[PDB]
Amino acid sequence: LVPMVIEQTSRGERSFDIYSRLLKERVIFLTGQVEDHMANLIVAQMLFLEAENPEKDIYLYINSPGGVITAGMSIYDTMQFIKPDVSTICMGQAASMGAFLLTAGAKGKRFCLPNSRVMIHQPLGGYQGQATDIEIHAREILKVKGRMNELMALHTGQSLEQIERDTERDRFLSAPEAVEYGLVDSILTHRN
Amino acid sequence: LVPMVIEQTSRGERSFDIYSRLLKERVIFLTGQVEDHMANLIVAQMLFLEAENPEKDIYLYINSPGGVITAGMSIYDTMQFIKPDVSTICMGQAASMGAFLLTAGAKGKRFCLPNSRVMIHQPLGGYQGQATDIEIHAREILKVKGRMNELMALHTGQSLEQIERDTERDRFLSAPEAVEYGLVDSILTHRN
């Protein structure tokens, strides 16, 4: 179930769901495995927020075990397209796609909680079919891996070669380690 | 089904579901297994409550059999981030992640009902794959175990060594034992 909250306004009281009330405050929640439907919903929210105020920063909260790439690229491209700075925050964990989105946030506005964990790994896939077909899919996923590493290096500042060595296998990083890596600018230990 | 209640206000009568009505009184419910979606919902409620009144204490009621750790760390970090003192109450039972959130409450505001039971154990996990991947995941879960034990020790006030010896296996604590173990502060038997 989802609780309903009340907002006091000049016109009168309004009833909102907790998720929608936060959307009014330019907060978007990314939860669960990434997929076309959830990613599409996030894209819609970003566009709506941009129209309302294209100068106010948007906030994306990420707690994801990762998922499809294409679904993530849509969110990534949408964030890099709109004018508002998409401040990403990591709550609980960020997986390969979550980490990519987390580090795709506006420079200086990427945060992590102290106990959050970040994992980066190379893409996963597979195909069954003829050898000719397999070669096509193999080359494609490799290009995706190359493209993903380039973007990660651009945002983190790390060299492309270093990213390849670290993404060859699942690499876990805590909030402090992520900062030194460059995925996130700072940590939100306590409110000030 | 969820019952609907009526609130008498100056503007007029308002229809609320039982959970929403208690949210208006700064009461959050953490029931069932912990997971990303429920944890995300709890996180939204805390933030909403903090904005509403960042000086009034929030109340979290825990009846959980435990669950994911990452989902729990998000709730923990959110509680330790916001200004309000999150008073935790244990109803029925608190499992490894429920107990962690229970003891994570504000000092002097962690209550337990007399017949409630608290269970603490070390993290659970697993992986299937190559030896290299196993080493990475095995190291990670151990770090999680260490991090959890440090936090438990800090909130309980027990030594880290004692926590490690008591968490090696499932340990069941009654409400009186929990008070002596520092997991809670007092017991609520009747209304004064």
Partner: peptide, 9 residues
């Protein structure tokens, strides 16, 4: 506001 980055009274 209501988020983390948002400031409160």
């Amino acid at each position: 506001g209501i988020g983390f980055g948002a400031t409160v009274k």
